Amino acid sequence: MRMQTKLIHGGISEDATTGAVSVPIYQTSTYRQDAIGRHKGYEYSRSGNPTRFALEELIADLEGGVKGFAFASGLAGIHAVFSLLQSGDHVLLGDDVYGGTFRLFNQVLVKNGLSCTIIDTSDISQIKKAIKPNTKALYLETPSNPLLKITDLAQCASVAKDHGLLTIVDNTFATPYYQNPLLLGADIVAHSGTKYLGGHSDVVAGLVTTNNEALAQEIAFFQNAIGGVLGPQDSWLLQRGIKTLGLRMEAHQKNALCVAEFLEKHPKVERVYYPGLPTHPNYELAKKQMRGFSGMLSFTLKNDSEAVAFVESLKLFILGESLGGVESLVGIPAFMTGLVRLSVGIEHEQDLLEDLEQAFAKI
Amino acid sequence: MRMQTKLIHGGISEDATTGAVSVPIYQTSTYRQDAIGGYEYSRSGNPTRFALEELIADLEGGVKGFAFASGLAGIHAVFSLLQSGDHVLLGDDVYGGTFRLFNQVLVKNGLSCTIIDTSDISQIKKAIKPNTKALYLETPSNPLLKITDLAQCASVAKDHGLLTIVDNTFATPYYQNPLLLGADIVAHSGTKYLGGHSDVVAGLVTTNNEALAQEIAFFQNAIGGVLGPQDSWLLQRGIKTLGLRMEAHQKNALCVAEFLEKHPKVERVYYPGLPTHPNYELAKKQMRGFSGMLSFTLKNDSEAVAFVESLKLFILGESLGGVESLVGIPAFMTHAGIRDGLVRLSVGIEHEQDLLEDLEQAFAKI
Amino acid sequence: MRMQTKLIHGGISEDATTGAVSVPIYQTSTYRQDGYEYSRSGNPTRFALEELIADLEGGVKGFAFASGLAGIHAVFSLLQSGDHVLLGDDVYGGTFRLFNQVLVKNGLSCTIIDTSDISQIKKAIKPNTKALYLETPSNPLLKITDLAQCASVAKDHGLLTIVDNTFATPYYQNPLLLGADIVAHSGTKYLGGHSDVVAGLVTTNNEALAQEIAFFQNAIGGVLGPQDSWLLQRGIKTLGLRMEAHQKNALCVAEFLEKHPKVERVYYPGLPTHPNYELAKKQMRGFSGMLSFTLKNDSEAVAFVESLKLFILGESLGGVESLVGIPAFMTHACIPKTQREAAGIRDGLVRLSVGIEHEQDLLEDLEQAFAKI
Amino acid sequence: MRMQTKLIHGGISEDATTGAVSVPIYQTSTYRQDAIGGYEYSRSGNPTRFALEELIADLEGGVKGFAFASGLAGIHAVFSLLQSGDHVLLGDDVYGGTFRLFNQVLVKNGLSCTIIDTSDISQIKKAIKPNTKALYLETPSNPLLKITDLAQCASVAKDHGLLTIVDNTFATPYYQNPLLLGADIVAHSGTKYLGGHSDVVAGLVTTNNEALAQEIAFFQNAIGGVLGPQDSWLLQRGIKTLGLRMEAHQKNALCVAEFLEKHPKVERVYYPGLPTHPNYELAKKQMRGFSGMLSFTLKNDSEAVAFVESLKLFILGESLGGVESLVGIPAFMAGIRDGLVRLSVGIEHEQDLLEDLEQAFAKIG
C-alpha cells in the first residue's frame, strides 16, 4: 500500500473487535486485569492507551520506524528525546533551529549538565569541526524555520555515524508525506503534531519515532518516567487530522508556489525564502531528499519599516503564532520567535493573492 | 463560599461572554491577534486549561495553578526549578514513580537525593547538607499511609534555605491544605481523586509564591507537558463532585478498616482514621478527614495473591481514587515496611455492604 | 619495576642486537630498504627516549622535539581555526607568546584565568573551547592547581587537559594518572638536568591523540636530533637522585629564607604555610628545586643578586648548577610594571633554581649576600 | 492601528464596563475583596495609573509600563535593580539631575560610574569593567543635542552581559523607539513632551523583557514612588495630542534653527534637524523626526543673560516640552559655555516666535 493509502489504513485505523472504521476514544485512566502478572495488554494510561497506541503505530508506519510515541506537545517529545543523555554530554544544534528547542537547551537542558554548540548545518565542515570527545548527538531540522534553510540529511547522517553520534531530525515542516529522514540515515524523528499532521490548528501534540529497538526502549522509558503523554482525545483528533495530510500537503504546496512566484515578481519584495523556488540556495539538494515542498515561506520587502503595516492590513491570512493549519497564517519572527513568515493554507489561491495584493496597495 | 460551594463555583466555573454554566472546551492550538504585541498559543495558555488552573489554585489557596499531562509531568517540572549540583531530601516511602524520577531521570541530570523517614523530625535535621535546596513530602504515605507533621517539617525547612514541596494526592484539597501549613509547592495526581472517575490522566501543581509561580510557569511552557483542553474540562467536571465523593470515600473506608481490623485472617490495618494508627492525633490535627486509601497485611503472607484474585467487586488494577473500588499488591505493581503480603485498597463509593460482602467471600477462599 | 628502576631500564635502554647497555647514536638521515625509513619520521635513538618518557608518565607514545616550545606547538597544531583555549594566568611567557604571536594569527583564541580557582575556568568556557592548558606548580609564584578536579571538569565539557609538567617532573607528578590527556615537558630543564641540552618532550594517554601528535611532529619537522635524544636520555637516568637532592636543598633554602629578617614572603610548595600545601601533598610525591622569595625592600633585590657568587645569574632552570634571576628584570622585563605587581611579580621578587651543590655552600652564599645589603 | 491612531485608542482608552471614552479617575486607596485569594492597594495597582502604563508600553513597544512620581523617581527605580559593587557607563552630558542621582545617591549605595562620550562607540568599549552591568544613553542629549547610535551601542552592550537603558524624553515615542533598536529599558520624564502642557510632574518607564518587568514592578511598589491617579489621567489626556504637538514643535524648531544659523550675531547652533550637525545622517536613520529642543551659543558670550531677559514671548523658566515656549541658560539652571542658551520651542505661531527673537537680538552689541 502507498503513502496515500497508508494515511487512511496505516498503523491501527480500525477497532479489531467491533469493526469500527474509527479507533474508539479510550477516555480511561486504568484497566482491569485478570490474575496478577497477566494483563489484558494495558495496565495504566500513562504507560499505554489503545487510542494513543493506534496513533503511535500510524506515525511509525509512515516514517518507517519500529515504534511511535505521542506527547503533550512538540517540545515535550523533543525533551524526552534528550532525556536519553547523561550530564556531561554534548549536542550540536543547527544555527536556526526552532526557538523553543533553543530555549530547551539554553534554559532547561544546559542547566542540567547538557552542553550544545550552534553551527550552520548546511555547512558540513562546520559540524566536522564542532565535535568534542563528549558530543553524543547531531540535531538537524530541514527545511529550517524561518528562512527554509536546507541541510543535507544523508551526508550529515553518514558523518554523524562514523563518529559515535545520534542523528536526530525535526521533520515538522516537511511532513512524512514529503520527507523520511529515517530512510536517509536518521535514528530519531520528531514532529510537532500541533502543525501540519493535525492540520486544523486544533491540537497540541508531539510525535517521535525511531529506527532502533534499543532507542525505542529508551524513549518509551522516559515517556512513561516523565509522563508528558498525549491524551486519548487529542491522539484521536491528531490521527483524524493525519488522514487528510496528503490532500492538504498537496494543496499547501500548490498554493505556496503561486504565492512564492507572485511574491518574487513583486516591486515591494526583495528576497524570498521558499524551497520550491529554483532560486533558493540548495534547491537541488531539496528535490533530491524531498518529494515536495510544504506551505512555509519567509520573505522580505525592500522597505524594511513597513513590515508591520503590511501584516496588520491583511484580511484573509490570520495574524497569529502557529503554522501548518488549513487557514493561512502570518507572522514576523522578530517579535514572535523586517522578515515576514507565511503559512500558506488551503483557501482558494486567487483569494490569497487578492488578499496579498490589497495589503501591498496599502504601503 | 465554603469548600463545598467553591468546588462548584470556584476559579472560573462559568463562561463570561455567553453565560454558559460550564466552561467551553477550546480544542484550539492558536489564536488570532489584533497585535503585534490574552491568549497567543495553547501550550503557553488555554482558556479551558486556565479555568481549571484557577480552580485548583482557588481550592488550595495558591496564587496560580498549573495543569500537566500527568501527575509525574507535574512533579518533574517542579524539580526543573533546580540546578545540577543541588540536593533534595526524600521520604522513605514516597510514591514509586517519584522515586523512579530521581533514580532514573534526575540524578543523571545532576541532582542528588537522600532518603529519610519524614515522620522522624530529627532525621531531617541530621540529613541537611549545604547544597540541600528542598524537602519533598507525601502525607499520608503511599502505600503505608504514614503521617508526617507538615507544620513542623516546613518550620525546620523554612529556617534553612529549603523549599517545602508536598504531594497532596491522597488527601486532596478537601481534607488537607499544605500551603496553609507552611508548604511552598503543592502537587497532585489529578488522575486520582480530583478526576475521581478513573477516566483522566492529569497533574496539578499550585503555589503560595508569586516568583515560584513564574518558574513553574516557565517550565510548564518550556518543557511542554501540558494538559489538553478536553482532559482539563473533564478534570474540572470531576472536581465538582469531589466533596460528596470524599465523604463517601471516607464513610466506606472507615467501615472497611473497622471490618479488616476485626478480621481473624488480618494482622495490621494501615488507615489514618483508625484510632490505633501511629500519629492518629496528628492526622486529626492537620486533616479535616481521611480519604478512602488503606492497606492491610494478612497474617499469612503467601495467601495475598489468591485473596486479591478472588475479589469480585474490587477491580484488580493499577490506579486509585476512582468511584470504583480498586485493589493492588504494591510489591508486584507500583513497586521499609512493605511485605509481599501487603494489600492496598482504594475503597470506592459503592454500597458499604457490597464492599464488605466482597471481602467476606474472598477471605473464605484462603 | 618502580619509578627509580624505570629511569634506568624503562622505554628502550639497551641495544637488542649488540647487547650495549646504552642505545647507539644513529647519526643517520636515511636507511636502506629491501622498520625505519627517514630520521625525521623515525630514528632509533629518538625512539628509545620517546618510549622512556611515555613509560615514565604512563603514556602510549612519546615524542621528542627540538625544544619545549616546539612540542607545545605540535600539541596546539591539533586544533582547527575557530577553536578556543583556556590558559593559566601564570603561563610561561613563551607559551603565552606562542598564542599571542603565532597561533592567534592562525585562528585560535584564548582567555587567561587563574587555574587555582576552579569556578573561573567554568565561567570562561565557551561553546567553542576545546582545550585547557595547565602548569603546576607555576612559574614564578609556584601556585598549585588541582589536577584531578580540573581534568574532571574539563572532561565533562568537551575539553582536552594539557599539562606542562616541567617543574614537578614525572618523578613527583603524573598528570595522565590524574585525568590529563597530554603531558608536555621542556627536556631542557630537570629531565636533561645538566643545562647542556635543549629539548621538548610530549606524551599522551590517547592512541587517537598520539596519531595526531605523530603526524605534526613529522609534518612540521621540529624533531629532536639523535645526539640530543641520547644526551637527554643519559640525563634522565639520574633524574631521581637529582630531584631528591634538589628538593632537599630547596627545602633547606626555603626554611633558611623565612627565618630571615630581610625576606618577606617565600614561595615554595614544600612549606606548610604555602597556599594549597595540602593539595600539593595530594597530587605530588615531592616538590622541586624551584622557589622564589620576595624581600621587604624592592630596590635591595638587585644588590642581593649581584653579590651572589655561587648561584649563577642565568635565564634557565633545573640544572645541577644553582640559578638566580629577577623575573621582573629578565623573564618579564617587557611587561608594564603596574601589570607585573597586578600579577604578583614585584621588582623585589627573586627566583632560585636550587641546584645540587652542598647545601651549606648554598646557604653561606645567601648569608654573605644578605650581609651585603 | 498607526502611531497617530494609537495615541488615541492605545493601551486602555475606554472604560470597559460603562463605555466611557475616557478612563475614569480612581481617587481610591483601597478596594473591597471577596478574598482571601484585580486591584488590592493603589500603590500596587490603580486602574487609572494602569491605563497610562499600558498606553506607554503600547507606544514604545514594551510588555509593561510603569508610572512614577517623577522622571527621576523612575530612573531611580530602574537603577534600583543593581547590587552594590556593580558598574555603569554614563553619557558625558546626561540630564543634570541624572548625574546628581548617581553622584550623590546611588554611588554611596555601592554603585560606580564612568562618564564617557557615547557618540564615540570606541570609547564605551574602552571603559567596560568585569563588574559593569549597564550602559545609560540619552539621545538627543541635554543640552547639546549630541546624537548616540542606539542600534550599535545596544549591540556592543548585548554581546557583553550589559543592559541598555535609554532616556527617551527628548525625542518622544513619536520620533524614536529605542526598544526596537535593541534597547532593554526606556525611560521618560512625562513632565516634558508627553504631558505637553507643563502642568504635570511624572515619569514613565517601559521594557521589552518579562523578567525586567517583574523587577521594575517590584521596585516601583517597594520604594513607592508611584504616580497618582489624577496625574496619570492628565498625562494620558496630554499624550492624546502628542503627534499633533510634536509635528508643530519640529516645524517651529526647524524654522528657528535656520534663523539662528544664518544670523550674524550667533556663533554655533545645536539642532539634529540641521544638515550641518554632527551625525545628522545618524539622526535621520534612527529618528522619524527632530523635536522642539535646540541650543545655541552666540558670538558675544557675556551678553547671554541680557538676551534671555529681553524675550517677551518665550518664558524664562525651568523646564521643557510644553505648548508654551521656554528658555534657559542650562549653566545657571564639557560643551556647556556660560553663554549657551537653550530653547524649548513651543507650538505658537512661528512668525511670533521669530519676531520675539529679532527684537531680542536687536538689543545686544
CATH number of the structural domain spanning residue B77: 3.40.640.10
Q: Measuring CA to CA, which residue among B172, B105, A132, B147 is closest to residue C127?
A: A132
Q: Which of D37, D61, D214 sits opposite B58 (nearest CB)?
A: D37
Please tell me whether residue A139 adopts helix, strand or coil conformation.
strand
Whether the CB-CB separation of A318 and A308 falls below 8 Å is answered with no
Residue C160: HSE in the Cβ half-sphere, 13 Å Cα cutoff: 21
Position A130, amino acid: A
C295-C300-C301-C307 Cα dihedral, nearest 10 degrees:
-120
**Resolution in A, one decimal?**
2.8
Within 10 angstroms of residue D247's Cβ, the number of other Cβ atoms is: 14
Q: Take residue D329 and report the three cell numbers written for it.
A: 541658560
Q: Measuring CA to CA, which residue among B22, B5, B24 is closest to residue B13?
A: B22
Whether the CB-CB separation of A26 and B198 falls below 8 Å is answered with no
Q: Kindly report the nearest CA distance between residue D37 and chain B, in angstroms.
A: 6
The angle that helices D210-223 and D71-79 make with each other, rounded to 10 degrees, is 120
Residue with grid cell 554523524, as numbered in its chain: A160
Q: Take residue D254 and report the three cell numbers written for it.
A: 526647524
Give the separation between CA A171 and CA A192, rounded to whole angstroms.
8
Asked if C293 and C230 sit in the same domain, the reply is no
Active-site residue flag, D167? yes
Q: Kindly report the nearest CA distance between residue A117 and chain C, in angstroms.
A: 5
Interface contact B33, partner A, CB < 8 A? yes
Residues of B within 8 A of A203 (CB-CB) are 27, 29
Yes or no, beta carbons of C156 and A113 under 8 Å apart: yes
Give the separation between CA B310 and CA B327, rounded to whole angstroms.
11
Give the separation between CA C28 and CA C25, rounded to whole angstroms.
9
Give the separation between CA B320 and CA B332, rounded to whole angstroms.
15
Of the residues C239, C267, C285, the one at which a domain ends: C239
Asked if C145 and C247 sit in the same domain, the reply is no
**Residue D293 φ then ψ, to 5°:** -95, 125
Whether the CB-CB separation of D304 and D341 falls below 8 Å is answered with yes
Residues of A within 8 A of C131 (CB-CB) are none
**Residue A40 φ then ψ, to 5°:** -90, 20
With contact defined as 3+ CB pairs under 8 Å, the chains touching D are B
Give the separation between CA B34 and CA D105, rounded to whole angstroms.
43
Q: Take residue B331 and report the three cell numbers written for it.
A: 510489591
Q: Which residues contact C307 (CB under 8 A, 6 or more apart)?
A: C368, C369, C372, C373
Give the separation between CA C357 and CA C311, rounded to whole angstroms.
10
Decide: D and B in contact? Rule: 3+ Cβ pairs under 8 Å: yes
Active-site residue flag, B95? yes
The vertex-D82 CA angle with D77 and D84, nearest 5°, equals 125
Catalytic pick among C90, C146, C164, C228:
C164
Interface contact B241, partner A, CB < 8 A? no
Interface contact A134, partner C, CB < 8 A? yes
Asked if A189 and A275 sit in the same domain, the reply is no
Asked if D20 and D149 sit in the same domain, the reply is yes
Whether the CB-CB separation of B300 and B293 falls below 8 Å is answered with no
Q: How far is CA C343 from the centre of its chain?
A: 20
Whether the CB-CB separation of D166 and D186 falls below 8 Å is answered with yes
Interface contact D60, partner B, CB < 8 A? no
Asked if B283 and B195 sit in the same domain, the reply is no
Q: Which of B73, B199, B223 sits opposite A27 (nearest CB)?
A: B199
Q: Measuring CA to CA, which residue among B24, B287, B326 is closest to residue B192?
A: B326
Of the residues B221, B242, B263, the one at which a domain ends: B242
Give the separation between CA D301 and CA D108, rounded to whole angstroms.
37
Strands A329-331 and B87-91: unpaired
Sign, Cα dihedral of C14, C15, C20, C23 = negative
Please tell me whether residue C318 adopts helix, strand or coil conformation.
coil
Please tell me whether residue D48 adopts helix, strand or coil conformation.
helix
DSSP H stretches of helix in D229-346: 229-239, 242-261, 280-286, 305-308
Q: How far is CA D12 from CA C134, C249, D8, D237, in A?
A: 61, 84, 9, 12
Q: How far is CA A83 from CA A112, A160, A189, A226, B98, in A?
A: 10, 19, 15, 9, 16
Q: How was this structure determined?
A: X-ray
Give the separation between CA D212 and CA D81, rounded to whole angstroms.
9
Catalytic pick among B15, B31, B39, B43:
B43
Residues of B within 8 A of D37 (CB-CB) are 57-58, 61
Interface contact A347, partner B, CB < 8 A? no
Q: What is the DSSP letter of B294?
A: E
The region that residue B355 occupies, defined by phi over 0 for left and psi between -120 and 50 for alpha, beta otherwise, is alpha
Within 10 angstroms of residue C23's Cβ, the number of other Cβ atoms is: 25
Residue with grid cell 554581546, as numbered in its chain: D159
Residue D197: HSE in the Cβ half-sphere, 13 Å Cα cutoff: 12
Asked if A68 and A207 sit in the same domain, the reply is yes
Q: Measuring CA to CA, which residue among B205, B189, B176, B173 is closest to residue B79?
A: B205
Residues of C within 8 A of A117 (CB-CB) are 127-128
Interface contact B61, partner D, CB < 8 A? yes
Give the separation between CA B190 and CA D272, rounded to whole angstroms.
63
The vertex-B74 CA angle with B69 and B80, nearest 5°, equals 125
D267-275 long-range contacts (CB < 8 A, ≥24 apart) are D267/D296, D267/D297, D267/D298, D267/D299, D268/D296, D268/D297, D269/D294, D269/D295, D269/D296, D270/D143, D270/D144, D270/D145, D270/D294, D270/D295, D270/D296, D271/D145, D271/D295, D272/D140, D272/D145, D272/D147
Residues spanned by the domain of A257? 246-363
Residue with grid cell 639520574, as numbered in its chain: C238
Sign, Cα dihedral of C163, C168, C170, C173 = negative
Residue C139: HSE in the Cβ half-sphere, 13 Å Cα cutoff: 27
Residue to mutate among C157, C204, C207, C209, with most A CBs inside 10 A, is C157
Asked if D289 and D316 sit in the same domain, the reply is yes
C129, closest residue in chain A (CA to CA): A132
Active-site residue flag, B192? yes
Q: How far is CA A189 from the centre of its chain?
A: 9
Yes or no, beta carbons of A44 and B318 under 8 Å apart: yes
C312-313 sheet: strands from edge to edge: C263-267, C290-295, C349-353, C323-325, C312-313
Q: Take residue B216 and report the three cell numbers written for it.
A: 513553574
Please tell me whether residue A260 adopts helix, strand or coil conformation.
helix
Q: How far is CA C66 from CA B227, C38, C181, in A?
A: 68, 17, 22
Active-site residue flag, A34? no
Q: How far is CA D362 from the centre of its chain?
A: 34
Asked if D74 and D191 sit in the same domain, the reply is yes
The region that residue B141 occupies, defined by phi over 0 for left and psi between -120 and 50 for alpha, beta otherwise, is beta
Please tell me whether residue D187 adopts helix, strand or coil conformation.
strand
Q: Which helix (H) or strand (E) holds C159?
A: none
Please tell me whether residue B364 adopts helix, strand or coil conformation.
coil
Asked if D12 and D97 sit in the same domain, the reply is yes
Give the separation between CA C284 and CA A320, rounded to whole angstroms.
64
Within 10 angstroms of residue B263's Cβ, the number of other Cβ atoms is: 16
Catalytic pick among C6, C26, C55, C92:
C92
Number of domains present in the structure of chain C:
2
D185-189 sheet: strands from edge to edge: D64-68, D203-207, D185-189, D163-167, D132-137, D86-91, D111-116
Residue with grid cell 541598555, as numbered in its chain: D164
The vertex-D216 CA angle with D215 and D221, nearest 5°, equals 100
Interface contact C156, partner A, CB < 8 A? yes
Position D70, amino acid: S
Interface contact B58, partner D, CB < 8 A? yes
Q: What is the DSSP letter of D52?
A: H
Q: Take residue D337 and report the three cell numbers written for it.
A: 559655555
Yes or no, beta carbons of A134 and C160 under 8 Å apart: no
B87-91 sheet: strands from edge to edge: B64-68, B203-207, B185-189, B163-167, B132-138, B87-91, B112-116
Asked if A241 and A252 sit in the same domain, the reply is no
Asked if B196 and B279 sit in the same domain, the reply is no
Question: For B274-317, where are the E strands, in sequence order?
Answer: 293-298, 315-316
Of the residues B242, B267, B288, the one at which a domain ends: B242
Domain containing residue D291: CATH number: 3.90.1150.10
With contact defined as 3+ CB pairs under 8 Å, the chains touching C are A
Whether the CB-CB separation of C136 and C282 falls below 8 Å is answered with no
Q: Measuring CA to CA, which residue among D327, C327, C102, B117 is closest to residue B125?
A: B117
Whether the CB-CB separation of D356 and D311 falls below 8 Å is answered with yes
C24-C25-C30-C35 Cα dihedral, nearest 10 degrees:
40
B60, closest residue in chain D (CA to CA): D37
Yes or no, beta carbons of C156 and A88 under 8 Å apart: yes
Yes or no, beta carbons of A27 and B222 under 8 Å apart: no
Yes or no, beta carbons of A237 and B201 under 8 Å apart: no
**Residue C56 φ then ψ, to 5°:** -75, -45
Asked if D319 and D331 sit in the same domain, the reply is yes
Q: How far is CA C226 from CA C48, C183, C191, in A?
A: 10, 22, 16
**Residue D173 φ then ψ, to 5°:** -55, -15
Q: How far is CA B296 from CA A362, B147, B327, B333, B341, in A?
A: 76, 16, 11, 16, 9
